[PDB]
Short mmCIF file of N, CA, C and O in Angstrom, two decimals:
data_model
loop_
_atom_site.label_atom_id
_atom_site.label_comp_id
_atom_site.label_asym_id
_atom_site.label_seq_id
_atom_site.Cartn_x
_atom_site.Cartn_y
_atom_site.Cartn_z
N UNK Y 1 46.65 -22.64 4.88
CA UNK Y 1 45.50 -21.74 4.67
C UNK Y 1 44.23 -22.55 4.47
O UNK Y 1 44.38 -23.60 3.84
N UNK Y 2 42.96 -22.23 4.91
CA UNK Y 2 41.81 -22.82 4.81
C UNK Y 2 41.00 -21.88 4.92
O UNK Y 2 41.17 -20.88 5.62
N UNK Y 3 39.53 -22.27 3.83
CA UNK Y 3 38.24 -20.98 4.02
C UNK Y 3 36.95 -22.32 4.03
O UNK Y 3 36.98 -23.35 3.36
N UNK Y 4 36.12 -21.96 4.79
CA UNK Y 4 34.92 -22.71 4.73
C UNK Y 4 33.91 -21.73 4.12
O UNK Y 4 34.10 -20.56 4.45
N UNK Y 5 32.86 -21.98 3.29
CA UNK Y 5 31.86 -21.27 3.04
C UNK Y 5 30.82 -22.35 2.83
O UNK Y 5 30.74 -23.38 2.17
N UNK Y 6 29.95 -21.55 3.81
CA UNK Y 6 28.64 -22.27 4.02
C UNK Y 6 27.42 -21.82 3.03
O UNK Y 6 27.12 -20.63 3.12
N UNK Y 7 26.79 -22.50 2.23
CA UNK Y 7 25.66 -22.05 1.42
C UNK Y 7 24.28 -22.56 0.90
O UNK Y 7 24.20 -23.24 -0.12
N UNK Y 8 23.55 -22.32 1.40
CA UNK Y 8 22.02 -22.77 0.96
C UNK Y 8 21.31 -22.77 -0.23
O UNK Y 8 22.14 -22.82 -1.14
N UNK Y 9 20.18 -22.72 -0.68
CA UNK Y 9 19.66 -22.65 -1.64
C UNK Y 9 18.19 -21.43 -1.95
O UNK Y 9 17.41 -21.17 -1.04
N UNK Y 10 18.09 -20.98 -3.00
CA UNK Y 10 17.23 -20.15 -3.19
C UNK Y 10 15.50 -20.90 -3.34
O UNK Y 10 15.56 -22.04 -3.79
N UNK Y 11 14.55 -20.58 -3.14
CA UNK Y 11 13.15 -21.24 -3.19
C UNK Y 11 12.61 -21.49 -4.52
O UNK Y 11 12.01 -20.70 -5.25
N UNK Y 12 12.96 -22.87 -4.74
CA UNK Y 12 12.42 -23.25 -5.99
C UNK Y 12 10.76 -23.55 -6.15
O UNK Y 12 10.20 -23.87 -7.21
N UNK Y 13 10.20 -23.39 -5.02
CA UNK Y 13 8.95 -23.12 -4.96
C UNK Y 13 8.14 -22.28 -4.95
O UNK Y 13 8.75 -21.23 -4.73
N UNK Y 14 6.40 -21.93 -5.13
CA UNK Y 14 5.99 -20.57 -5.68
C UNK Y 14 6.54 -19.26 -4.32
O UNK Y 14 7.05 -19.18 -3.20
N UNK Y 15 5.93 -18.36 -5.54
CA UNK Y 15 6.33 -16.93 -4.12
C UNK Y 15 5.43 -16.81 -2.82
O UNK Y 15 5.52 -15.87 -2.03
N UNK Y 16 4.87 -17.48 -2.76
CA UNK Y 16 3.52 -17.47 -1.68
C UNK Y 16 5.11 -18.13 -0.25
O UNK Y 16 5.91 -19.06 -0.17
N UNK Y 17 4.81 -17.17 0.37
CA UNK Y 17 5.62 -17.32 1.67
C UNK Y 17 4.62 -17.51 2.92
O UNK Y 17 3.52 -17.11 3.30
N UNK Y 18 5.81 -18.47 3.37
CA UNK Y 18 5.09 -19.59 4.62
C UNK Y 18 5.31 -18.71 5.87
O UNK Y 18 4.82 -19.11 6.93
N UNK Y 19 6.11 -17.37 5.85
CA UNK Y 19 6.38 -16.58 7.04
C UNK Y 19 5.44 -15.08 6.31
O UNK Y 19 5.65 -14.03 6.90
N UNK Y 20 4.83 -15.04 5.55
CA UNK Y 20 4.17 -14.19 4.93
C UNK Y 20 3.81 -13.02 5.92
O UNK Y 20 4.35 -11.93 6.09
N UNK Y 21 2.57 -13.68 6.59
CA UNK Y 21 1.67 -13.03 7.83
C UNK Y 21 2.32 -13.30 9.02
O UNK Y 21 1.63 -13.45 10.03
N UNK Y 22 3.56 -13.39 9.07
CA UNK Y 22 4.24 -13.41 10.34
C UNK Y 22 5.19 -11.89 10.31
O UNK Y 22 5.82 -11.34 9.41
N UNK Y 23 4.92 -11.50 11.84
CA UNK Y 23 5.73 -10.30 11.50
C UNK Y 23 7.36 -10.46 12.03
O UNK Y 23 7.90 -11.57 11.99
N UNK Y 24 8.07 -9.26 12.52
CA UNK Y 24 9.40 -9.70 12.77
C UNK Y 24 9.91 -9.94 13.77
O UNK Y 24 11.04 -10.40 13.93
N UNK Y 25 9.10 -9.65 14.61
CA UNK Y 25 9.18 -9.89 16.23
C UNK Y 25 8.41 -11.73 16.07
O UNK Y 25 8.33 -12.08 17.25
N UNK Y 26 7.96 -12.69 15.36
CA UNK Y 26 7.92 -13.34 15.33
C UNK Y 26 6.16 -13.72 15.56
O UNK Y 26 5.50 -14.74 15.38
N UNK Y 27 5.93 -12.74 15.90
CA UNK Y 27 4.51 -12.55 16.54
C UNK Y 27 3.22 -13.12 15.51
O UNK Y 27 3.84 -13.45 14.50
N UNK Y 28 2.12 -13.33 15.30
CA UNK Y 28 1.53 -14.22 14.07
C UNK Y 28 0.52 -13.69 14.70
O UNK Y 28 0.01 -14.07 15.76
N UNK Y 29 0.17 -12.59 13.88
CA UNK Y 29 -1.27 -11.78 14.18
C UNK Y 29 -2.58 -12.60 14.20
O UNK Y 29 -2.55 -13.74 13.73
N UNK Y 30 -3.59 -12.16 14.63
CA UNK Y 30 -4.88 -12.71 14.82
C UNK Y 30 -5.90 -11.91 13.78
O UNK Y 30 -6.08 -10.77 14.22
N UNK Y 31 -6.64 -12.13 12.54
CA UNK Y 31 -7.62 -11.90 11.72
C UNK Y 31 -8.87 -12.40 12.31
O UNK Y 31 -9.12 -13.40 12.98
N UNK Y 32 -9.59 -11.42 11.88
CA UNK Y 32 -11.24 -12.31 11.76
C UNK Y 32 -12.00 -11.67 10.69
O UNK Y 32 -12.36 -10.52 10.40
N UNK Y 33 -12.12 -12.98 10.15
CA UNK Y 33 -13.18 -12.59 9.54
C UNK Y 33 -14.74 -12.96 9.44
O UNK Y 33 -15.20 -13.96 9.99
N UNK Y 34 -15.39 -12.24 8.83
CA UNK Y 34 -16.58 -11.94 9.01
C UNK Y 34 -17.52 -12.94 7.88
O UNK Y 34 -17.48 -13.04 6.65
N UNK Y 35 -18.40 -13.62 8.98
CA UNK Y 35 -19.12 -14.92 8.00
C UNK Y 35 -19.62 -14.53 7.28
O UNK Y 35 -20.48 -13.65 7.30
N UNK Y 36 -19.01 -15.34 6.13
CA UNK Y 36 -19.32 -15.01 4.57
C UNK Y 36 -18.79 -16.22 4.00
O UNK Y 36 -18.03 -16.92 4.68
N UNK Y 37 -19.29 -16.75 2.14
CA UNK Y 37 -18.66 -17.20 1.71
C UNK Y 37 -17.16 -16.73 0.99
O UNK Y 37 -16.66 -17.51 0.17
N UNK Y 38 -16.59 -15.70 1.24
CA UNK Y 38 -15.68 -15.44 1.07
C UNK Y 38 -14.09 -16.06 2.45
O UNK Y 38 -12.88 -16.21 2.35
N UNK Y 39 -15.03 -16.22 3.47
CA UNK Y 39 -14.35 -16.39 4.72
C UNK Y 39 -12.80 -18.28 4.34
O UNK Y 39 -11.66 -18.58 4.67
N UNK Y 40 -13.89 -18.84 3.54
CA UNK Y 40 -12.63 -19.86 3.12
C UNK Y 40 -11.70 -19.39 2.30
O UNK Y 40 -10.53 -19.77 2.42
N UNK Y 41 -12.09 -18.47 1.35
CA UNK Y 41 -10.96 -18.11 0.64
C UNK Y 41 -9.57 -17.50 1.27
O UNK Y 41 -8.41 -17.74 0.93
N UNK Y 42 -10.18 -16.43 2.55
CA UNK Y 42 -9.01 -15.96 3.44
C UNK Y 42 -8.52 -16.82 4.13
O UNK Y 42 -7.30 -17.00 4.18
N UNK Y 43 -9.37 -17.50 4.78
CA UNK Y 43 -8.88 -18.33 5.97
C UNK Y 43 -7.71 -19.38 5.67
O UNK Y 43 -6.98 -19.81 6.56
N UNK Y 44 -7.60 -19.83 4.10
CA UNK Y 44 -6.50 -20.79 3.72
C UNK Y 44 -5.40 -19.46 3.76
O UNK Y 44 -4.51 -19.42 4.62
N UNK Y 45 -5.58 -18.30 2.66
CA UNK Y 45 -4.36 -17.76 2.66
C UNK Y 45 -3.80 -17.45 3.98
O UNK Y 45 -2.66 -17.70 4.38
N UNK Y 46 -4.82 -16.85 4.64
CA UNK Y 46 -3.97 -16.31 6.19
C UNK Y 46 -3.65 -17.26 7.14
O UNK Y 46 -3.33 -16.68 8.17
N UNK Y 47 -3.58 -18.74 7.29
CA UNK Y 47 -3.23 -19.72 7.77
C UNK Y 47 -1.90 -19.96 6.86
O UNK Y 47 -0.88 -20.00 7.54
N UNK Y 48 -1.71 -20.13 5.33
CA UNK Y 48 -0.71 -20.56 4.61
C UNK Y 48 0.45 -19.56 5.10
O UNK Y 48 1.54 -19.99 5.49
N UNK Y 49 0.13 -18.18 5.05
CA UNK Y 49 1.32 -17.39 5.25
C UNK Y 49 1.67 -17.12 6.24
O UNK Y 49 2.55 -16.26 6.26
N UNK Y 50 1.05 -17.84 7.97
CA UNK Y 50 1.52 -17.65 8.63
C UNK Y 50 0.97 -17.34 9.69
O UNK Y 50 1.63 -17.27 10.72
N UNK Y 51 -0.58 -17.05 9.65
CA UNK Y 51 -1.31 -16.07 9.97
C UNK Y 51 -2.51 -17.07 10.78
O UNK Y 51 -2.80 -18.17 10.31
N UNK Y 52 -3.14 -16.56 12.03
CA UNK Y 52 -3.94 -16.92 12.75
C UNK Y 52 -5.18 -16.25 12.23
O UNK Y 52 -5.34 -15.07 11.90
N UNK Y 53 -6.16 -17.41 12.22
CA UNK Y 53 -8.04 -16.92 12.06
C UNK Y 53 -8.54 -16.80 12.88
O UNK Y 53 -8.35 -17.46 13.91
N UNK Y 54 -9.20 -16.10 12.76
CA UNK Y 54 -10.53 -15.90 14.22
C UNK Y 54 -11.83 -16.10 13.47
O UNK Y 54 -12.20 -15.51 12.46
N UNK Y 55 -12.36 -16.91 14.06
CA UNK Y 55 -13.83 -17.34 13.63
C UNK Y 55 -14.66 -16.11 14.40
O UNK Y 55 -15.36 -15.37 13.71
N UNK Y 56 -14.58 -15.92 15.83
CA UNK Y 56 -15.62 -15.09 16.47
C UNK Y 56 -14.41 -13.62 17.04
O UNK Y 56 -13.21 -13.71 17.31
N UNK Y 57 -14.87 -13.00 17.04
CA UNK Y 57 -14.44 -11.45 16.97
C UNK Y 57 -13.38 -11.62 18.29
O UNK Y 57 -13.96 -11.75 19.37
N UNK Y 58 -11.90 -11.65 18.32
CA UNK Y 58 -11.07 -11.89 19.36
C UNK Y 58 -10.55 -10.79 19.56
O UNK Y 58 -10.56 -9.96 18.65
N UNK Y 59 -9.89 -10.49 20.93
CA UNK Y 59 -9.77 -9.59 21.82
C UNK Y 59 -8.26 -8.90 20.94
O UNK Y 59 -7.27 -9.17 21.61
N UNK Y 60 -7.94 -8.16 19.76
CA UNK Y 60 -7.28 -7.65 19.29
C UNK Y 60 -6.86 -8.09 18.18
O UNK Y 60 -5.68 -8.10 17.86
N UNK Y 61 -8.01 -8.57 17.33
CA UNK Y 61 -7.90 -9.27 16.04
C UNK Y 61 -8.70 -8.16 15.17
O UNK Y 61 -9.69 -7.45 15.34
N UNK Y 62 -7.66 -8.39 14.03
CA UNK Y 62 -8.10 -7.17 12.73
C UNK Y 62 -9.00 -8.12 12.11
O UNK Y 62 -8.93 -9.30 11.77
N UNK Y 63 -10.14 -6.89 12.08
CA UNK Y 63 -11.58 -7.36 11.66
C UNK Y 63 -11.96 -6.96 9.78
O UNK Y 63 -12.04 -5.90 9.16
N UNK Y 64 -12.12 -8.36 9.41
CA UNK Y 64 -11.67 -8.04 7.74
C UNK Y 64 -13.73 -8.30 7.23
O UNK Y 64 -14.64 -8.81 7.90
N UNK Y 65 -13.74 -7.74 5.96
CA UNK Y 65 -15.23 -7.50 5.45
C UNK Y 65 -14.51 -7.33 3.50
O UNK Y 65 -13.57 -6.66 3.07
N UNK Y 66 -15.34 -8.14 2.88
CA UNK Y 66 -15.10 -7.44 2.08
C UNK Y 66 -15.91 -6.37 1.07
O UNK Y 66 -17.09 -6.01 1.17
N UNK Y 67 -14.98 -5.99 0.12
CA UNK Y 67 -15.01 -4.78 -0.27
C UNK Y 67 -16.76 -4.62 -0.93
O UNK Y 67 -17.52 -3.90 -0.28
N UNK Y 68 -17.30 -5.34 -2.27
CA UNK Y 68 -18.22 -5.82 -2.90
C UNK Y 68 -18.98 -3.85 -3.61
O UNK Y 68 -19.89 -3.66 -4.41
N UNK Y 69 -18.31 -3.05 -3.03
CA UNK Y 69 -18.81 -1.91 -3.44
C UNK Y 69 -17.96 -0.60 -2.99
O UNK Y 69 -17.03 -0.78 -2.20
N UNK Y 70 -18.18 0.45 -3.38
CA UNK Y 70 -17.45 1.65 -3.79
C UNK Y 70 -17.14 2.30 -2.21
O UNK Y 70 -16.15 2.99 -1.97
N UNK Y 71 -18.15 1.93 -1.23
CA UNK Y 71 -17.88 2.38 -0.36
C UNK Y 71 -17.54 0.40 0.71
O UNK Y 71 -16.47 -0.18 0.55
N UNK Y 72 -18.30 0.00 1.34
CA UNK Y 72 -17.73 -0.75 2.37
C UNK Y 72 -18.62 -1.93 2.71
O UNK Y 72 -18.16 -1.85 3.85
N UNK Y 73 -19.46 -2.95 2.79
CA UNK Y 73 -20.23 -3.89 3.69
C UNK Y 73 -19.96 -3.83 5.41
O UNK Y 73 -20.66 -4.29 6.32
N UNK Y 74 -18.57 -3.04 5.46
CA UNK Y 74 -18.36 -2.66 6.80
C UNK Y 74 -19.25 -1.98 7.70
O UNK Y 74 -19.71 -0.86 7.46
N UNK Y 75 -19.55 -2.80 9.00
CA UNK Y 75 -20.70 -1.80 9.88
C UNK Y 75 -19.94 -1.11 10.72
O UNK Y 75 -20.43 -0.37 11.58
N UNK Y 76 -18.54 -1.29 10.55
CA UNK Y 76 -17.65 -0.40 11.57
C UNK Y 76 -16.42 -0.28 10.96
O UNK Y 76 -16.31 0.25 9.85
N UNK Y 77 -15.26 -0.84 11.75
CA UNK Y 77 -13.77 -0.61 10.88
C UNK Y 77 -13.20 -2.19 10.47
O UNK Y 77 -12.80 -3.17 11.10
N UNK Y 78 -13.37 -1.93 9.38
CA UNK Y 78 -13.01 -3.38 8.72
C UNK Y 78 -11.83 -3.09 7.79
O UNK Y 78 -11.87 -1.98 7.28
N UNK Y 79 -10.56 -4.03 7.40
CA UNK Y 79 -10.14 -3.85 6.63
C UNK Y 79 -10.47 -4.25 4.85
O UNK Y 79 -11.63 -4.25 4.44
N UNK Y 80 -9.76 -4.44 4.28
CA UNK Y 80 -10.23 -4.61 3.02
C UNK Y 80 -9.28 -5.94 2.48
O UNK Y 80 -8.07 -6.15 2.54
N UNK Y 81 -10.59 -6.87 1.82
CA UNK Y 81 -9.74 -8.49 2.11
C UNK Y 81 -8.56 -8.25 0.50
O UNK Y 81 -7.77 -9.13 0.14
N UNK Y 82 -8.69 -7.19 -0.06
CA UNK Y 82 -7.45 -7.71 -0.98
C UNK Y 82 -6.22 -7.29 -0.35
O UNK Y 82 -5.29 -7.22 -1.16
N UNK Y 83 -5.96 -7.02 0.70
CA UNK Y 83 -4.73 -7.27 1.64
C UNK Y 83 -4.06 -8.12 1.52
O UNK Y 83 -2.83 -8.16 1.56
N UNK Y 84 -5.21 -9.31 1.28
CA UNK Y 84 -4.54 -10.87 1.73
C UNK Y 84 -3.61 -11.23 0.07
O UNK Y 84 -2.72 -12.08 -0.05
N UNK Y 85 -4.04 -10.46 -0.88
CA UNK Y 85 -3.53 -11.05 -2.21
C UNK Y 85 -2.11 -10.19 -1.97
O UNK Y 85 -1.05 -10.78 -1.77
N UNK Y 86 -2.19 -8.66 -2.02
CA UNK Y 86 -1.09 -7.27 -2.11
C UNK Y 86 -0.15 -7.89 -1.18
O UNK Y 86 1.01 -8.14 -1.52
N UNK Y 87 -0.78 -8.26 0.40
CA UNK Y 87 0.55 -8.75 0.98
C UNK Y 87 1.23 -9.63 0.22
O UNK Y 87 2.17 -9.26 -0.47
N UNK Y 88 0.75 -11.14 0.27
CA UNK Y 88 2.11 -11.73 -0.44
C UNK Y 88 2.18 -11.65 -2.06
O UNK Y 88 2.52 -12.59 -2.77
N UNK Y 89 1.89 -10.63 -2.42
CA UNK Y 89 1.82 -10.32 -3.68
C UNK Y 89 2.99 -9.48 -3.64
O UNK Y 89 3.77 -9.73 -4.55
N UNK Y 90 3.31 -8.63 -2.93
CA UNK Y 90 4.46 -7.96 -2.23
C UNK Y 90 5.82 -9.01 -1.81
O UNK Y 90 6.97 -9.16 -2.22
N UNK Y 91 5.06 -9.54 -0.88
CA UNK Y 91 5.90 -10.64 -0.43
C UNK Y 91 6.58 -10.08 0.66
O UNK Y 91 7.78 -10.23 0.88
N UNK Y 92 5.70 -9.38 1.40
CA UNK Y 92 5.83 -8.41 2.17
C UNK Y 92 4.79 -7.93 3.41
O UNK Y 92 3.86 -7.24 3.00
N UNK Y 93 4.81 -8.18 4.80
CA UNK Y 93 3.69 -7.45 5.45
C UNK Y 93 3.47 -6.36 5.40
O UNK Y 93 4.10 -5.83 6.32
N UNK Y 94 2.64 -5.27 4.57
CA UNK Y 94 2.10 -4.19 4.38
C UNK Y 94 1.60 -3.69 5.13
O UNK Y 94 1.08 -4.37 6.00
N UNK Y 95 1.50 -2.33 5.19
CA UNK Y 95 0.81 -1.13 6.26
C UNK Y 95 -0.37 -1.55 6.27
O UNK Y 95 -1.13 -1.03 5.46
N UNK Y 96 -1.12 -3.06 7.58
CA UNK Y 96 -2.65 -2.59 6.91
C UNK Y 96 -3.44 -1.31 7.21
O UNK Y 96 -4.49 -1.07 6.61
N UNK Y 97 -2.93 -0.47 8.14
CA UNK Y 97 -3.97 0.44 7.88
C UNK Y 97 -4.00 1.24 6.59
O UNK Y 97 -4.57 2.32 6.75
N UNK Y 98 -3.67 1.09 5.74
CA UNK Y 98 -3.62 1.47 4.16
C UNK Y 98 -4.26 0.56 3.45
O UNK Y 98 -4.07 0.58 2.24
N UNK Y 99 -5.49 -0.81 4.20
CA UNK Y 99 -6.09 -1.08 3.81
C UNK Y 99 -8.04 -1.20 4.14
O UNK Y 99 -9.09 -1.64 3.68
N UNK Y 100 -7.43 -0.41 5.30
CA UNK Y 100 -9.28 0.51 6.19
C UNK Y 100 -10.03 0.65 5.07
O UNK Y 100 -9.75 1.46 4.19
N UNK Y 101 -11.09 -0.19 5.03
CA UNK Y 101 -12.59 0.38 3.84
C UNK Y 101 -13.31 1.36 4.43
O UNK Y 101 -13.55 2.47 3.95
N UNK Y 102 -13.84 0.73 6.03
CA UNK Y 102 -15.08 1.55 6.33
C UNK Y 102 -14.37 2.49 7.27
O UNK Y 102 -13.34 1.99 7.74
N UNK Y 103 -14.63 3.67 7.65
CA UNK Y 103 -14.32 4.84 9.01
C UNK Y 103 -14.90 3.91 10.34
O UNK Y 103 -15.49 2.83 10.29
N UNK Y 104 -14.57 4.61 11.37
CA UNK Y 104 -15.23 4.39 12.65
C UNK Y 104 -14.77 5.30 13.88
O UNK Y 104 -13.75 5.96 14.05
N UNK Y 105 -16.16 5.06 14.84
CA UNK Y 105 -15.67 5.92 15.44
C UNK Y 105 -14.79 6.27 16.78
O UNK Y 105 -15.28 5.97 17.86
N UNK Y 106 -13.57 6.87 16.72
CA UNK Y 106 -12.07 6.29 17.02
C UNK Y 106 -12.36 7.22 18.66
O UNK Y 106 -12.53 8.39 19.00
N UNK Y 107 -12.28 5.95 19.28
CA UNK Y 107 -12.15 6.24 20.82
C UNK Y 107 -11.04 5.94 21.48
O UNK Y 107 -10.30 5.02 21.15
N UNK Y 108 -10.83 6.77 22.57
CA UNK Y 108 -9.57 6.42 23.34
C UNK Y 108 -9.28 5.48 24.31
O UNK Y 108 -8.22 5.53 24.94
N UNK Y 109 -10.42 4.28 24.55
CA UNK Y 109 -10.41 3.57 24.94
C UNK Y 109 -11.38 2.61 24.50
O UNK Y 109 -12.35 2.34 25.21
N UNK Y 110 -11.06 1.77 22.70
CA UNK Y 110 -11.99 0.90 22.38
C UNK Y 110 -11.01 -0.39 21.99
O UNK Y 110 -11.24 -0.83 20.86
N UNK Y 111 -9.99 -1.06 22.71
CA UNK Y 111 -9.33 -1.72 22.35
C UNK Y 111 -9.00 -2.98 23.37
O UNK Y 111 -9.36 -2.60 24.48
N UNK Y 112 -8.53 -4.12 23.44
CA UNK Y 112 -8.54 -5.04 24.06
C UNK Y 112 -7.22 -5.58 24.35
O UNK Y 112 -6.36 -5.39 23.49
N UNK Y 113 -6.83 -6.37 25.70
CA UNK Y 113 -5.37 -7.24 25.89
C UNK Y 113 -5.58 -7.98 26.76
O UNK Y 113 -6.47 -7.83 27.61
N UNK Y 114 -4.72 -8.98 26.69
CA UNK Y 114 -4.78 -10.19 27.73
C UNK Y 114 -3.84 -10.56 28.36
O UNK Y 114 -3.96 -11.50 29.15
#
């Protein structure tokens, strides 16, 4: 009689995950954000977890602004940058559209692919 069991180890390092902003199809979304001094603060997290920056507005990249007031700094549809904390605060990729600040106006053909 013989049994092999194979076993790894649990992450003795912080919860901030290196597949964070990666989704499950493997795919590593595209952000942009919007020049500001806030733009380094995202740009490390969404690179650390996984996640591609966009410096200039790319052809199907979620366009982030932040919040700074009750309604939006958004001039169109921006999300809302505490995403970047809730996701891996979660430890989890979250619904962002459950993180939309500003409205916009939703056409049936305003979207981009390559």
């Amino acid at each position: 009689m013989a049994e092999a069991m194979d076993l790894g180890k649990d992450p003795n390092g912080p919860t901030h995950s290196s597949t964070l902003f990666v989704r499950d199809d493997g795919s590593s979304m595209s952000f942009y954000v919007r020049p500001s001094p806030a733009k380094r603060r995202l740009s490390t997290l969404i690179l650390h977890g996984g996640g591609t920056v966009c410096r200039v507005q790319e052809p199907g990249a979620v366009l982030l602004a932040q919040p700074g007031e009750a309604l939006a700094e958004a001039s169109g549809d921006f999300i809302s940058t505490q995403y970047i904390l809730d996701c891996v605060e979660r430890n989890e990729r979250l619904e962002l559209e459950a993180y939309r600040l500003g409205p916009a106006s939703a056409a049936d053909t305003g979207s981009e692919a390559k």
